[PDB]
């Protein structure tokens, strides 16, 4: 645990009293966290698809999916059905553990981390983190790390507005 109790006992009641909601479960909730790779180099490196798949299994036990091109493109030498990137959907204790690991290690481990972007909101109440380093937190085995292709994290919340999502994230510990 270490996050579920903290949430239910500090974020939900405080945020509910702050926003004057008419019900208990009207408080916005973090539904899921989607991690996308999107490596497009597979055209030139067929084995690159294997990369970020063995790394994602260690980042989170949930094995990623080998997403395939839904449309072909000549500018990128693409054909429909060819593998591109990777997808992972964390729902349950997995997303809580991922948030804990992130907040505890990844952000403080970054060398020049200061005032994470505030405009990363999608305008509806969802947050996205743009990672450009492949070795952010310890489960990536710096020694075995060869490529530095970062990651793309998508935080999804039931928030109907961006202000309440910002408040929820700040109270959770997102160092804006």
């Amino acid at each position: 645990n270490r996050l579920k109790e903290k949430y239910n006992k500090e974020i939900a009641p405080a945020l509910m009293t702050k926003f004057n909601y008419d019900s208990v479960m009207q408080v916005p909730k973090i539904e899921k966290i989607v991690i996308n790779m999107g490596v497009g180099d597979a055209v030139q490196n067929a084995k690159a698809i294997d990369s970020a798949v063995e790394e994602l299994t260690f980042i989170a036990g949930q094995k990623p999916v080998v997403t395939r091109a839904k449309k072909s493109i000549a500018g990128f030498r693409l054909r429909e059905g060819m593998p591109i990137g990777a997808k992972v959907t964390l729902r349950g204790e997995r997303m809580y553990d991922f948030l804990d690991k992130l907040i505890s290690v990844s952000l403080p481990r970054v060398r020049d981390f200061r005032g994470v972007s505030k405009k990363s909101f999608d305008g509806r109440g969802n947050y996205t983190l743009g990672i450009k380093e492949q070795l952010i937190f310890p489960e990536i085995d710096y020694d075995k790390v060869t490529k530095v292709r970062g990651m793309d994290i998508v935080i999804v919340t039931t928030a109907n507005t961006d202000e309440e999502a910002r408040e929820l994230l700040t109270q959770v510990g997102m160092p804006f």
Partner: protein, 92 residues
Amino acid sequence: RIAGVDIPRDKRVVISLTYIFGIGRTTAQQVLKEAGVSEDTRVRDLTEEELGKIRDIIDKLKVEGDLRREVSLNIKRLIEIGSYRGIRHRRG
């Protein structure tokens, strides 16, 4: 790592510390003298005591994290203030 950047494991500490920007020959040797490691040791073969010693020494001293920003600030200042020197900088 000590300064957030990996260092060669099969090299001496003196030169392993030089791979950190801002920490060159003199700075690395001074840090090693302050830590009392004799400057002839492998970095893959060390203990928590002398590791944390160098860690805190670096945290107290300047680091690439600060130098990268200070140099950029100075460059942008001398470029914005006119400074035919800064004009040459912008020209490259």
